[PDB]
Design a protein around this ligand. Structure first.
Ligand SMILES: [Mg+2]
Ligand SMILES: [Mg+2]
Ligand SMILES: [Mg+2]
Ligand SMILES: [Mg+2]
Ligand SMILES: [Mg+2]
Ligand SMILES: [Mg+2]
Ligand SMILES: [Mg+2]
Ligand SMILES: [Mg+2]
Ligand SMILES: [Mg+2]
Ligand SMILES: [Mg+2]
Ligand SMILES: [Mg+2]
Ligand SMILES: [Mg+2]
Ligand SMILES: [Mg+2]
Ligand SMILES: [Mg+2]
Ligand SMILES: [Mg+2]
Ligand SMILES: [Mg+2]
Ligand SMILES: [Mg+2]
Ligand SMILES: [Mg+2]
Ligand SMILES: [Mg+2]
Ligand SMILES: [Mg+2]
Ligand SMILES: [Mg+2]
Ligand SMILES: [Mg+2]
Ligand SMILES: [Mg+2]
Ligand SMILES: [Mg+2]
Ligand SMILES: [Mg+2]
Ligand SMILES: [Mg+2]
Ligand SMILES: [Mg+2]
Ligand SMILES: [Mg+2]
Ligand SMILES: [Mg+2]
Ligand SMILES: [Mg+2]
Ligand SMILES: [Mg+2]
Ligand SMILES: [Mg+2]
Lengths: 115, 50, 149, 77, 50
RNA sequence: UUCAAAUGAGAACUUUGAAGACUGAAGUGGGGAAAGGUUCCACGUCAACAGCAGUUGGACGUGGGUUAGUCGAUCCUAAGA
RNA sequence: AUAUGGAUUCUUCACGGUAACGUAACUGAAUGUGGAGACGUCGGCGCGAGCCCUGGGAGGAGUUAUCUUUUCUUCUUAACAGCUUAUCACCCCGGAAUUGGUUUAUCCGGAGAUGGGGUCUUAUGGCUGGAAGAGGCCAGCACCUUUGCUGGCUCCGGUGCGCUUGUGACGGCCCGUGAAAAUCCACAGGAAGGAAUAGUUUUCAUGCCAGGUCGUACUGAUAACCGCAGCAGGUCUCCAAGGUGAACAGCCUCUAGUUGAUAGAAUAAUGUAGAUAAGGGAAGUCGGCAAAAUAGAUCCGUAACUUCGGGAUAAGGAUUGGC
RNA sequence: CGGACUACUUGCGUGCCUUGUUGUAGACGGCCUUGGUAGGUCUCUUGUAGACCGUCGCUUGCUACAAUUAACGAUCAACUU
C-alpha cells in the first residue's frame, strides 16, 4: 500500500514562446485551476505540483494523472486561446512532450527582388 | 518566412536553357506503341502517304 | 519554426550571358587548352603504337577512346571546382576511318560482338571491325570540352 | 526448429562439418519483476533444422562467442 | 471455366489468334477485292459453341 | 441529387475536390461451382453501338499478363456402362 | 542410394514394472487373421476456438459557445517441433443393507460399489523454439534526383443462459437401423540368416540426390451465363458487426460498395398508388367485395361437443411510460 | 613582375560522435548470518527503530474454544422476478 510513486511530466513550450504567440505562465495557471483530482477542481492539496521556468512546464504528481489528461487540458487551453489549427501537442519520448507548429508553406516573395 | 523565401530561390539549369519551350524530339506513333513494340496493322506500309 | 520547400517543375532561360567579358574568356581559353592537350596526347599514343611499334601489342580504337576520355576528365577535375555548376566532356572521343564520316566510338565490351556481326563480310571495313590501323588510312580524331556551357 | 540446452551438445553440433552459418541475436527484455537484461540467442543452421541456444546471463555469452569455431560465417543481429 | 481441358484451351488459343482486322498492306495489292474481314468474331456478339 | 475547378471545339451525364443520401452483414460487401472465353490490365482513341448525351466504356486499334513434389485432375470404387 | 554415431549379442536376435503398460533403437519369409479407410437424424448438457462486450497504461485523430480525467482508433503471432495437459476406459489393494454412489435427463455395484493409489488415447489448451529480425502505430531528417537514412513504443487484465462453429459423453426414433473399393498398419506363424571381430539395423539420430504431364487471368449476374438484347424473368454454395426487440422480423448505424435508370418548366380534367372525413351505420351490391376494427406481453377466466387425446389464443375482463 | 584557380600539403583555438583507457559509474543470488518485512499487534505521525505477543508465518507434531459443529457472523461478480 506504500506505492506512492511520484510521476513526472515535461512539456516544452520554447518554440511558440520564442516565436511570440504563447505564454507559459498563463498555461501553468490554467493547469492549476483546471486539474481535477478526486472529481473536484482546486483539490490540489499536495497531490500534484506544476512549475514553469519559461521554457519547460513540469508536473509532478502522485495522483491519477495519465498523459492523455495533460494532452486533453492543453488542447482545451489552445482552443480557448484560438491556437488550434496552428499548434499541436506531440510526444518526443515517454512523458516528455512539446508544442509544435503545423506545416506552413511560405508566400510568393518574388516582387522586385523581395527575396 | 523571409528566411524560407530566401532559401527557396531559383537555380536554373542548362536543360532549362536548351529544352525549355521544346516538344519531344520523337515521332507521333499514332497507335501509341513503344519502340520495340509490334504494330501488325501498319508494319507493311512504310510511308505516311500510303 | 522552418516553413517548407517545393519542386516547382517550371523555369525558362536567363540574362547577362554571351557578352564575352574576362571570366567568359577565361572559361573558353581553359576549355581550349584542355582540348589541345588531349589531342596532343592521343596523337602521341597513335604515333607510339603505330609509327615506332617497339616490342609489344598495339592499342585499338576502344582503348584509345577510353584512355583519351579518362585523361580529359583527370585534367578537367582540378579546374573551376565549386565555382561553376557543370563541367565535363562536350563531344566524346571519336576516331573515324576512311568511309565513316561521323559517330565511331565503340565501347570496350563490343569487340567480340563486332567480330561476330561482321563475320561473313569482306575486308573493306576491317580497321573499324578489328580496331587495329593499317597503312594507308585517314584517321579522323574529334573531341570537345565544355566549362559551364 | 530445435532448442538446445547442453552447451557441449551445441559445440559438437556446431562442429558437424555440414553447417556453414550461425547467427548471434541480442535482444533486451525484462525479468520477473525489476530490471532490464540482455539475452543472446545462438542460431546454427543445419541442413534440415535450425538449432537455437538461449543464454540469459551475458557473462558466458562472450566466452561462447570467443570459443566459437573460426570457419562459420557468423552473422550479428 | 477456370478448370478446363487442353482441347478447350487449344481451340480458345486458335480463336484468340484469329481475332484481328485486315492488314493494311493487303489493300494496296493489284486487283484487290478484300475490303474487310468478313469472319470476325466477338465474345458478346456470337458464341463459339465449344 | 447539388456546387466549384480541370480537360476539351463543345460537359445534366468524364476526372478530382466539396456536400446530401442509399445498400444495412438472409448486402448494392468479399470468394467460388456450372457456363462464357480475354470480357482482366496498360497505352492510343470516337465513324458505328451504349432507345438523351458522351471528351466516357465490357465499344474501336496495338500490346502485356495465368510459374506448384504439398491446390486440383491424374488413382479408387458407386448407381451403372 | 548410401556412410557414420548409437542400440543389440560369446546366455546370439533388449530391458524395466504385481499389473494396466513404459522406452530412441530392440531380426522375422510363405501363409492366415484383425483394425483403420468406414458413415442416419433429432434433443439437451459439458468443453475449445473465433467474434461480441469491458478496465489501467503508452501513442495518434476529432469536439471544445457551455460541459465532458471526454469520443474514436493501434497494442498482433502461422504451419511445424520439444515438454506438459482429459471426459471415457483399464489395473492393484479392499470387501459393501442402517444399501451406497450419482446425471439437467436414473442408471450402476459379490460378474467386486464407495474409498485409497496408479496406467492410457492427445480432441484440445499452456510454456518454449519458429520470432521480432516480421507486421503495426507514431516522430523525424537530406526533404534537390525516377535517390537515400536514423529514432521510439508494440504492455498488463475481466466477464458470460451471449453469437457462430468444432468436438465429447449420453438420450429419443424406426415393419426406415442409415455405401464400396484402392490404400496403410498390426498380430499369429517360425522359413531363413546369423556375435567376436561380427550379422541386424536406414521402423533410433544425422548426412546425400530426385520429384514428370495438363489446369490456374476475370465475371459469376437489374451489363461478362441462358431467355434473338447491356431483357424488372431464371440459375448451386461459404463468411456475417452495434442498437431496439423473443428473434437471421421490420427500422437506424460501422467496415466495404454505389449514387446507376433521358432531362427542364408548370400544377387542367381523367387515371395509377395511397389517405382523411360531420350525423347515420350495410339502407349499397348477385354477394359486407374492399376497407375499418383486432393484434405483443403479464394476470384472471373460458361453453356445447368429443375418438378423452382435444376444442383452446375458445368467449370475456384488468393492465403496460419515466424516475 | 601574377594572379584569374583553392589545393596547392603547420600548429593551435571552438566543438560532434566511436570513444581505448581509467576518473566517475560500482547498476546485482553472492550468504561473511541474530528479535521477522506485505508476519499478529503496539509507543514509534504509518511501517521501520524497539519490542510485545512468550513463538506470528500456507504449514506441522502440541490440544484445543456457536472448532464458519447447528454455522446466526466476516470474503467477489451476471440479469430475472
Ligand atoms: Mg453453329
Ligand atoms: Mg444523371
Ligand atoms: Mg430502406
Ligand atoms: Mg439506411
Ligand atoms: Mg446466413
Ligand atoms: Mg477494363
Ligand atoms: Mg483508355
Ligand atoms: Mg446514344
Ligand atoms: Mg452522339
Ligand atoms: Mg480492347
Ligand atoms: Mg537399450
Ligand atoms: Mg449435439
Ligand atoms: Mg494456418
Ligand atoms: Mg498443415
Ligand atoms: Mg451451418
Ligand atoms: Mg494400427
Ligand atoms: Mg492463380
Ligand atoms: Mg484467381
Ligand atoms: Mg474472381
Ligand atoms: Mg455469389
Ligand atoms: Mg458477388
Ligand atoms: Mg435477376
Ligand atoms: Mg446472352
Ligand atoms: Mg434481367
Ligand atoms: Mg436485449
Ligand atoms: Mg435485427
Ligand atoms: Mg362518417
Ligand atoms: Mg346488406
Ligand atoms: Mg339489401
Ligand atoms: Mg337495393
Ligand atoms: Mg375483405
Ligand atoms: Mg370454436
Amino acid at each position: 500500500r506504500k506505492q506512492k510513486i511520484a510521476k513526472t511530466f515535461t512539456v516544452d513550450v520554447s518554440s511558440p514562446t520564442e516565436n511570440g504567440v504563447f505564454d507559459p505562465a498563463s498555461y501553468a495557471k490554467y493547469l492549476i485551476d483546471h486539474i481535477k483530482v478526486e472529481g473536484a477542481v482546486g483539490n490540489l492539496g499536495n497531490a500534484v505540483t506544476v512549475t514553469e521556468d519559461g521554457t519547460v512546464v513540469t508536473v509532478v504528481s502522485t495522483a491519477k494523472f495519465s498523459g492523455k489528461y495533460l494532452k486533453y487540458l492543453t488542447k482545451k487551453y489552445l482552443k480557448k486561446n484560438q491556437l488550434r489549427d496552428w499548434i499541436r501537442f506531440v510526444s518526443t519520448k515517454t512523458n516528455e512532450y512539446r508544442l509544435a507548429f503545423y506545416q506552413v508553406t511560405p508566400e510568393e516573395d518574388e516582387e522586385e527582388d523581395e527575396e | 518566412q523571409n528566411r524560407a523565401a530566401r532559401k527557396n530561390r531559383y537555380v536554373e539549369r542548362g536543360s532549362d536553357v536548351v529544352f525549355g519551350d521544346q516538344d519531344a524530339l520523337t515521332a507521333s506513333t499514332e497507335n501509341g506503341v513503344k519502340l520495340r513494340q509490334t504494330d501488325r496493322l501498319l508494319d507493311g506500309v512504310a510511308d505516311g502517304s500510303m | 519554426m522552418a516553413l517548407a520547400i517545393s519542386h516547382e517543375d517550371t523555369q525558362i532561360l536567363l540574362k547577362d550571358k554571351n557578352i564575352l567579358q574576362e571570366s567568359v574568356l577565361n572559361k573558353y581559353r581553359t576549355a581550349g587548352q584542355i582540348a589541345q592537350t588531349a589531342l596532343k596526347y592521343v596523337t602521341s599514343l597513335i604515333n607510339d603504337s603505330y609509327h615506332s611499334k617497339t616490342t609489344q601489342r598495339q592499342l585499338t580504337v576502344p582503348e584509345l577512346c577510353l584512355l583519351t576520355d579518362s585523361f580529359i576528365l583527370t585534367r578537367l577535375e582540378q579546374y573551376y571546382k565549386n565555382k561553376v555548376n557543370e563541367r565535363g566532356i562536350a563531344i566524346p572521343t571519336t576516331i573515324d576511318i576512311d568511309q565513316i564520316s561521323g559517330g565511331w566510338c565503340p565501347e570496350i565490351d563490343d569487340t567480340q560482338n563486332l567480330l561476330n556481326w561482321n563475320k561473313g563480310k569482306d575486308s573493306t571495313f576491317a580497321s573499324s571491325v578489328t580496331g587495329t590501323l593499317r597503312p594507308g588510312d585517314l584517321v579522323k580524331i574529334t573531341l570537345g570540352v565544355h566549362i559551364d556551357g | 526448429a530445435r532448442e538446445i540446452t547442453d552447451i557441449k551438445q551445441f559445440l559438437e553440433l556446431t562442429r558437424r562439418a555440414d553447417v556453414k552459418t550461425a547467427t548471434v541475436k541480442i535482444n533486451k527484455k525484462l525479468n520477473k519483476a525489476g530490471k532490464p537484461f540482455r539475452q543472446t540467442k545462438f542460431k546454427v543452421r543445419g541442413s534440415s533444422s535450425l538449432y537455437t541456444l538461449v543464454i540469459n546471463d551475458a557473462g558466458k555469452a562472450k566466452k561462447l562467442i570467443q570459443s566459437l569455431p573460426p570457419t562459420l560465417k557468423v552473422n550479428r543481429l | 471455366a477456370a478448370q478446363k481441358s487442353f482441347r478447350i484451351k487449344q481451340k480458345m488459343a486458335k480463336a484468340k489468334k484469329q481475332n484481328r482486322p485486315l492488314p493494311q498492306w493487303i489493300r494496296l495489292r493489284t486487283n484487290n477485292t478484300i475490303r474487310y474481314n468478313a469472319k470476325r468474331r466477338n465474345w458478346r456478339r456470337t458464341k463459339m459453341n465449344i
